[PDB]
Amino acid sequence: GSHSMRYFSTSVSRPGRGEPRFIAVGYVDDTQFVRFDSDAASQRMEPRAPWIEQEGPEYWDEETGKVKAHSQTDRENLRIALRYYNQSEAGSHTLQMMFGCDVGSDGRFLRGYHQYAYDGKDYIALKEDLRSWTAADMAAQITKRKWEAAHVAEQQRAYLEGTCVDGLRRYLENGKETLQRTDPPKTHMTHHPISDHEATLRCWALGFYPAEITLTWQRDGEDQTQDTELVETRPAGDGTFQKWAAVVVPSGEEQRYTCHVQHEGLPKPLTLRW
């Protein structure tokens, strides 16, 4: 019954094509609810889920100011990183940030995050105690020493333990009809003869929320992983998710095989047979 709020930002320099592009998105659990895109005409934080549209004009003004300020900060951080790594101004580089919080079933603070990656590799991350940093290479240690000196970690703690948790609590109530509900998977099995001697059984899970799911095969009631294929969970595009699991079986033995579906929206796991 835990929940999470995350903000994800991507800054990409593009020498010769203007200032770096900045895109930030916000999520509660597996639901996106806001975006900001430096290249868009709006220049506003924008809603991306119905239940955030309830927030008033002051919210959109304030959130817009905060995300714009972050965009300008990470533009400077891209410039600084180039200097720390002694890299040419001719190249394009990426600075990603993630921050946010986890809360338990009681809505109280569980964990906070505040972390960066440069060119796809960890740069610096706030540790779980919210007072120390993990610095990944000799450049990030310069930043770590500066941030230790300036008590940057303490400055983030009020947000991560307070404002972040408070916001997530409000969103969970305002959006409860999706965020505190589940869509169980719609399931079915298909059969594909692939040769005179083999057939493929494919077990489908469609339209489920949240994204966490487990699909497994058994043969005669024992786990079957040989000759299986399991696709990565993928978005349907409507807020829900899809997954399938397939197994190649000897023609005539289909009835020995069962597909097992575990999901939060299912009171009891499902067992499917051809």
């Binding site: 903000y7 916000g26 934080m45 959130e63 100011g65 905060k66 995300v67 300020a69 972050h70 900060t73 990470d74 400077e76 951080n77 600084i80 990183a81 720390y84 940030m97 921050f99 505040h114 310069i142 930043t143 500066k146 941030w147 300036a150 940057v152 400055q155 983030q156 947000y159 991560l160 404002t163 972040c164 408070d166 916001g167």
Partner: peptide, 9 residues
Amino acid sequence: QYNPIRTTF
């Protein structure tokens, strides 16, 4: 709710 990010590297 966003956190204003103003700290440089």
